[PDB]
């Protein structure tokens with residue numbers, strides 16, 4: 001158990017690191033998506049030829065090229081999430097194998113969480129907000145690739161209705177990483193002591209920052225259910241691609257995360 | 261939202277109804293499993309045959325692994341009626357759109373069956389027939405083909421879930437929370453369902469702070485288990501498909517197949 005002033009310090013600690021670790025915040029993403037700004041306007045990709053123009057503007061075959069782009073951005077995201085994780089008080093003091101295990105199982109759940117920040121019902125920001133690729137264009141891609149992004153959009157539309165801001169997400173992201181129920185953890189108890197602290201901070205953070213939003217804490221935790229299901233569908237989709245596209249390689253970092 | 265004394269009333273209402281609806285409570289099951297009228301123990305093939313002949317289990321009436329697997333289905337269908345009766349006592353439930361009531365039960369019973377199955381389990385086996393029998397985990401795990409591996413994940417879930425040390429008054433409210441999930445496919449009117457679940461969540465949170473004041477963030481930890489429940493339900497569906505498509509001895513009377521659809 002923690003005193004109320006220590007939880008506020010912990011929330012601020014975490015928000016500060018989240019800003020330092022992730023260059024495209026939700027606040028910046030919403031300013032680009034909402035608009036009314038002439039300096040932050042994205043170039044919009046909705047079909048093949050605007051995709052061609054995007055290369056010229058924002059800097060094989062289309063569906064593959066886009067999918068390879070998503071892999072590259074995922075590797076960067078794992079790198080950003082890994083950096084954030086080291087700042088969670090207690091994480092680096094854990095057994096190394098557990099540090100690796102918590103990241104292996106947490107990074108995708110956090111990626112889809114933060115990907116929601118860059119999404120509205122009509123598409124997703126790309127290339128640090130300089131581009132915007134429509135949900136419709138992604139849904140039209142051939143083979144198995146058309147269905148790769150749609151479950152993420154479905155989650156994001158629901159998840160974004162909670163109206164979390166970055167200061168909320170910073171703590172929620174930390175709660176996800178310090179899950180004591182990950183397969184293969186050696187010392188569950190130190191992980192759960194940390195997550196109790198993180199959960200207490202999130203509970204206090206949500207009550208102060210959304211006092212009119214009843215039971216947001218519970219509703220947000222129930223969303224970890226939706227994250228797990230997206231990870232599993234996605235792994236199953238990668239398996240199909242690996243067994244049908246033999247030209248296509250995965251980054252070792254991604255390859256290692258999905259083994260077992 | 262709701263005043264604290266109303267949550268205590270809601271918690272007690274749900275506890276009373278949970279008692280009347282389910283024959284074998286967790287308190288009673290825990291008395292039997294710990295050793296506190298000893299149940300008949302099924303640990304191998306011959307003790308199973310004697311259990312049928314002596315105590316006469318209604319779900320044990322083809323071949324052993326199949327007969328056991330179908331028995332689990334019989335009891336699951338009985339449990340669905342018990343859960344359905346309980347849901348009708350959750351304040352607000354029967355005032356929901358009839359299709360939505362049907363949708364919420366349809367998608368909720370699997371998660372509630374596994375939740376309450378844990379009450380009848382420890383690391384060594386499972387109570388059956390309202391506590392009169394006890395089937396060992398080793399015996400279930402030892403079954404052939406996919407049947408051996410069908411049974412083990414429930415024990416793995418149950419051991420972790422039981423570590424939270426919930427009692428029936430906690431579980432009465434948690435069960436109600438599961439049923440009022442606003443994210444089931446095909447719901448027509450989500451708002452009243454989520455309004456009821458907000459009430460239930462407040463009642464559950466207060467129940468857990470009062471009943472387990474030393475167990476910090478138990479409320480949070482219990483909700484995190486809804487991840488494990490959904491994952492095991494989806495695993496479970498995938499295993500039935502594999503059995504249905506591979507096991508030819510698994511056909512019953514057409515009327516029974518209809519009951520168990």
Ligand SMILES: O=C(O)c1ccc(-c2nn(C(=O)c3c(Cl)cccc3C(F)(F)F)c3ccc(OC(F)(F)F)cc23)c(OCc2ccccc2)c1
Pocket residue numbers: 319328331332333334335336337339369370373374376377380386387388395400410411412414415
């Ligand atoms: O009394 C009660 O509340 C109760 C409630 C559930 C079960 C029970 N359901 N079930 C399933 O498969 C299942 C599930 Cl979870 C959810 C939805 C649908 C099904 C279905 F597919 F079956 F339809 C089991 C599997 C294995 C099992 O044994 C175990 F867990 F592996 F050790 C017990 C179960 C139960 O079984 C008692 C029993 C055990 C052994 C022989 C005969 C009866 C009791």
